[PDB]
Ligand binder design. Structure first.
Ligand code: HEM
Ligand code: HEM
Lengths: 700, 697
């Protein structure tokens, strides 16, 4: 229907086709830094003092193509930071500022990130003067933070380490196929949090409060943070509004080329500064919108508000009787204005929940500072991962209970001879292979490569938020495996201290070695030590209530509330784990033949003899002498009807896909060859070593 | 609108968004074999003597879930190769057999490749026995070529080498959004069998076939070789009206394991399957070679009747031939039948002569069909240095872009410096050397690997006269100076011509780098030869003429899109990637490599000096842009005070507009990256100049 370079390919002929482009996004070819570049080794060598001494400079020179309000840019950079790490939705994990996606995406065109392309273009001198030693995400967010600092503040700190990706990330943002139309977080399509004029353009404070709380909750922010975040943020800078909001041009994706990749080039007046239009509201919040103080709340409790319209054609509030008419300084010189407020932010005065936590902030005006610093530092470094990546000399030392704190190694890391000793001690009185893998896999499947939260490290697999997960059948034998592993741990220690997660991954390794040896290959899985155990008080039970996978194909289990059919979720779960197209298929075959099945069902297994790591899943799948017909009980299962009329195999919806979707058919059509056995077991161990070492960030 | 794993973003909100996901396609991540796996090295060990002894067996055994007419699959295989090497489009170069795209693509769902999805399954007991030492594409077109030989025929040869791919390539097949360029009806690989556009008249079928095949290099005499030589084998499954067939494979319920067209009529297979909806049985012995097709084609006079499937097919009048055709599964014989496209060869005046001439002695038909089939198969492989295996018919050909054998003593870099010296110590300027070299290595298409810098065709008639290489400019001067150097060098180990072309290009890059302060050594691998004017035909090169070489900022007439896209579609052929594309475009813009001396695009104040000044001067926001008052697709870089300082084109400012490429320009446009930029430019350049060097890699 249209050319490929414009769109094209397939998907113009099929609406819902299993698109295999999401597995290998962000390839190593489109990386202009090269194939041997380590960002963690470079970003530590910048002189953050010199950088801090430079961003402070770019925040004072009013560039002539976009004038500076009050001769300072700080507000704009804080807004940039907030709209850069305000997309992080915990329901799946994708988004956030961990990829700096605000540059190129549907993000750099949402009808709220308007007048933000100019904000990024402002920072070009600093990135130009530094080069490859400053990834764009780090520059944006740290510029916001250093602005907040420069405008009079004492921040909690900051840490570099976010890496850039050079291709847009595909994330589901909303069913509404038009701007302003459960896995979501922005109540509109294109909004970040809330329609500034109240939900659905309706300026009601109560609905605004309900909605703003129901939105922030999908980003793990409490009730005290939300109030702190909003207040501390909007105590800075002004709005942008002039004539009718319909005069703005197109967005920086359908804009003409002479605009150098900008947008919203307003034709009204000179087009910038005193007449620039962006959100269609015209409000100044404080009375000195360029430096910090406890004044926004005073205005929040200083005048009684009544609704009005906007000179730009929008809804807002304004003090009655002309109170304070002409008391707030002009953004570019001129007579005073009237103290105004947005629609939502009045909720902080009427809503009874926020009232108890805002009325306290009139007196004790200092507590606002620390709470805002904490909430901000939480909003920033939310998608960086464990503590071991906070590079640079500005990170604090104290840990926070949301960081998933993992205590540092306080003993000698185990040795190699001890590794073989533990192998022998675990494969002689441990348990079957189908158990030592299932528990091990479950300890490394809570990972999410979106924000690198959770995983094998910490050993949380034996604590409350994960043992009770129904996906790891609690009334099964997982607790018995836990008892055995802890007792062999303490026995070897009584016989250099080995932690628990170390031993879990070692059990998985020894089980895979057992299966491979049963298959006829003396192969070894590479194991590196360097994990520690977490305690119940350092792992929040409620925070981890989202990692519980609603659909996990690699163990063949689907739950309830599943958005898409039970097949696509396999790739989705295989996309967070950052698995290439081959490493997903081989891993599926391995887990299927190894008996890593939820409740030990006879689904997925395609072998007459289990616990033997062979390619018997694939060779037996592609056989055409069997006919597949949906099950008679109609439970989303199928039946391997043979040529004799006897049911032979019984796979699930996540299996027969690996023999149907003509693309994924190819990868199987390799590992199922006659001489593929010396390759399968060798390509499998690689993928298994890759999964079990995703959260190993202290050494990689 | 929909989830990413099923549909995606970045497309619904804006349809006309420059999609860079077409550059990184076929990456190094989705490769099961992993990293290296030199396919050109593995297949050198397979026993074609044994592979033939196995495909011969898989054909004679009738599978129980798809019987074989007359107990032989030879037919269904012969077609499979054809529809696997019939997706060639000469006007672009994509498709072809060398992509193995017969599997995962819209290709395996077109309402023409029906029932063929079964054939890919009949071959599994063959590939399973070999695995990685024999890719699909080679196997598909071999089972094609190897079914002919096993059926009373001495073909011309065969060669492996078509390394497969692991993701569906992106190709434009047409504008219609419904089934039924090069194909005449969307989905139908070639001609709608029931006459062009459903009109059952042979005279129109002939004028359609002529133009259609003319889009795939086949002449007028190599056409009748195929059709007559291709439809001597096998029948056409079409019993029963084409109304009960299942859905297409890409959208079928999974209990079919990716097989499409689950026919509910009758038993569903065998003597009752449905493929295209025509019941026709050509020869009287449809599983061996003989001069039978032409015999029946002239044996009677024809008349149009209806089909048991509801299509228009023909049948001899007079009621003769009652039962003269063997029943495909034992029983009463049908009447002598025929398609609609075949009658063209009886009524069209052009094919009439050759058809009449093939009936006096059919050995000429055998030979012509042999050569035509060989051309139909080994077209998507290009240089003769890629053919592997024993069965290569290494004698010669004329359409293979032939080059003489590397005969003289090569060079051992002891004099390469002197050549790189005399090319500046007795030659021209950098703004001409890089221009002519890049021109001589721009006639390349990583699809079928035709053209290329090899052969030294930059001094021959088909390429010297192209418009994009302005002949009135100075190309002749550069070529004559290079010739004088070559002749002055061999009198004292002889060096060819394209040798000196790319060597002067590299030495000019070195000169420009010295003019910047980075004494960088360009790599160079000798071993290319110059072809003559006779072995370089003119008719097959008229397509390689670039219609929009965005690298050089040249826009011809005949672009379906603006210039901003015709750069990618160009930079997608050369097997480039976004970093290399940006770097190479910047280098060619700053080194003065436009098809004139135009200052259009140059963003420097001291040319002929390789540097990143283009990138850094592009991004400065203090410079505003607006369309020039000439309204000739040129923008006017207006400075802040009202003066003209830069003049760019659509191919330039796209790097300032499109957000993805903006990141790359940001990277190379720093200040501690000029060494990185010049080094990566040298690397990408040596990648371009060494695309067709297949005799070494
Ligand atoms: C949570 C609800 C929020 C709403 C409804 C909201 C809405 C808005 C609106 C309508 C504007 C004016 C846009 C324009 O002038 O074009 C704005 C700007 C701004 N926002 Fe937000 N925002 C929210 C959250 C935040 C947060 C979390 C922060 C900081 C942590 C923040 C900091 C700012 C600042 C400093 C500006 C001033 C921009 C300038 O001076 O140019 N806002 N916000
Ligand atoms: C204008 C060119 C062509 C037309 C109109 C045409 C038409 C057709 C049609 C409609 C079928 C029915 C498919 C089926 O029943 O499975 C068919 C089958 C077949 N075609 Fe073609 N085709 C063309 C080119 C070729 C070429 C170039 C070859 C060989 C080099 C070829 C060889 C065959 C064979 C052997 C079959 C029988 C397959 C079987 O019996 O399993 N055709 N042709």
């Amino acid at each position: 229907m249209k050319y490929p370079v414009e769109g094209g390919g397939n998907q113009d002929w099929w609406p819902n086709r299993l698109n295999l482009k999401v597995l290998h996004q962000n390839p190593a070819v489109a990386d202009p830094m090269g194939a041997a570049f380590d960002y963690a080794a470079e970003v530590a060598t910048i002189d953050v003092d010199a950088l801090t001494r430079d961003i402070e400079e770019v925040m004072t020179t009013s560039q002539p193509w976009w004038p500076a309000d009050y001769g300072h840019y700080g507000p704009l950079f804080i807004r940039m930071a907030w709209h850069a790490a305000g997309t992080y939705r915990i329901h799946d994990g994708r988004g956030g500022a961990g990829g700096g996606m605000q540059r190129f995406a549907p993000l750099n065109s949402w009808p709220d990130n308007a007048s933000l392309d100019k904000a990024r273009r402002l920072l070009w001198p600093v990135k130009k003067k530094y080069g490859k030693k400053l990834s764009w995400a780090d520059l944006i967010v740290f510029a916001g933070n250093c602005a907040l600092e420069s405008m009079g503040f004492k921040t909690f700190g900051f840490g570099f380490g976010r890496v850039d990706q050079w291709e847009p990330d595909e994330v589901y943002w909303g069913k509404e196929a038009t701007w302003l139309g459960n896995p979501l977080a922005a109540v509109q399509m294109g909004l970040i949090y809330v329609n500034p004029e109240g939900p659905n353009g309706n300026p009601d404070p109560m609905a605004a409060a309900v909605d703003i709380r129901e939105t922030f909750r999908r980003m793990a922010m409490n009730d005290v943070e939300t109030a702190a975040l909003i207040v501390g943020g909007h105590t800075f800078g002004k709005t942008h509004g002039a004539g009718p909001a319909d005069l703005v041009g197109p967005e920086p994706e359908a804009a003409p080329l002479e605009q150098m990749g900008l947008g919203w080039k307003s034709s009204y007046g000179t087009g910038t500064g005193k007449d620039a239009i962006t959100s269609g509201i015209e409000v100044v919040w404080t009375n000195t919108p360029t430096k910090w103080d406890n004044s926004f709340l005073e205005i929040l409790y200083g005048y009684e508000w009544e609704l009005t319209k906007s000179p730009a054609g929008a809804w807002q509030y304004t003090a009655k009787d002309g109170a304070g008419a002409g008391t707030i300084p002009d953004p570019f010189g001129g007579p005073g204005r009237s103290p105004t407020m947005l629609a939502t932010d009045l909720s902080l005065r009427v809503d009874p929940i926020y009232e108890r936590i805002t009325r306290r902030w009139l007196e004790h005006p200092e507590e606002l500072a620390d709470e805002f610093a904490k909430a901000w530092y939480k909003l920033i470094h939310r998608d960086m991962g464990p503590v071991a990546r906070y590079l640079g000399p500005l990170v604090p030392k104290q840990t926070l209970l949301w960081q998933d704190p993992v205590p540092a190694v306080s003993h000698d890391l185990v040795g190699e001879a001890e590794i073989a000793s533990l192998k022998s001690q675990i494969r002689a009185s441990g348990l079957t292979v189908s158990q030592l893998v299932s528990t091990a896999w479950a300890a490394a499947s809570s990972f999410r490569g979106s924000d690198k939260r959770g995983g094998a490290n910490g050993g949380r697999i034996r604590l409350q938020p994960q043992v009770g997960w129904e996906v790891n059948d609690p009334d099964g034998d997982l607790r018995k495996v836990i008892r055995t592993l802890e007792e062999i741990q303490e026995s070897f220690n009584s016989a250099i201290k080995v932690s628990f997660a170390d031993l879990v991954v070692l059990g998985g390794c020894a089980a895979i070695e057992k299966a491979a040896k049963a298959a006829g290959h003396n192969i070894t899985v590479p194991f590196t030590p360097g994990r520690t155990d977490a305690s119940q008080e350092q792992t929040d039970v409620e925070s981890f209530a989202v990692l519980e996978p609603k659909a996990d194909g690699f163990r063949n289990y689907l739950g309830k509330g599943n958005p898409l059919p039970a097949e696509y979720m396999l790739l989705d779960k295989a996309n967070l784990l950052t698995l290439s197209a081959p490493e997903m298929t081989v891993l599926v075959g391995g887990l299927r033949v190894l008996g890593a099945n939820y409740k030990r069902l006879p689904l997925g297994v395609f072998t007459e003899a289990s616990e033997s790591l062979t390619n018997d899943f694939f060779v037996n799948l592609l056989d055409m002498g069997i006919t597949w017909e949906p099950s008679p009980a109609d439970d989303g299962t199928y039946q391997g009807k043979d040529g004799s009329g006897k049911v032979k195999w019984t796979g699930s919806r996540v299996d027969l896909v690996f023999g149907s979707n003509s693309e994924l058919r190819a990868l199987v059509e390799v590992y199922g060859a006659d001489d593929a056995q010396p390759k399968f077991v060798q390509d499998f161990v690689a993928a298994w070593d890759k999964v079990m070492n995703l959260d190993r960030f202290d050494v990689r």
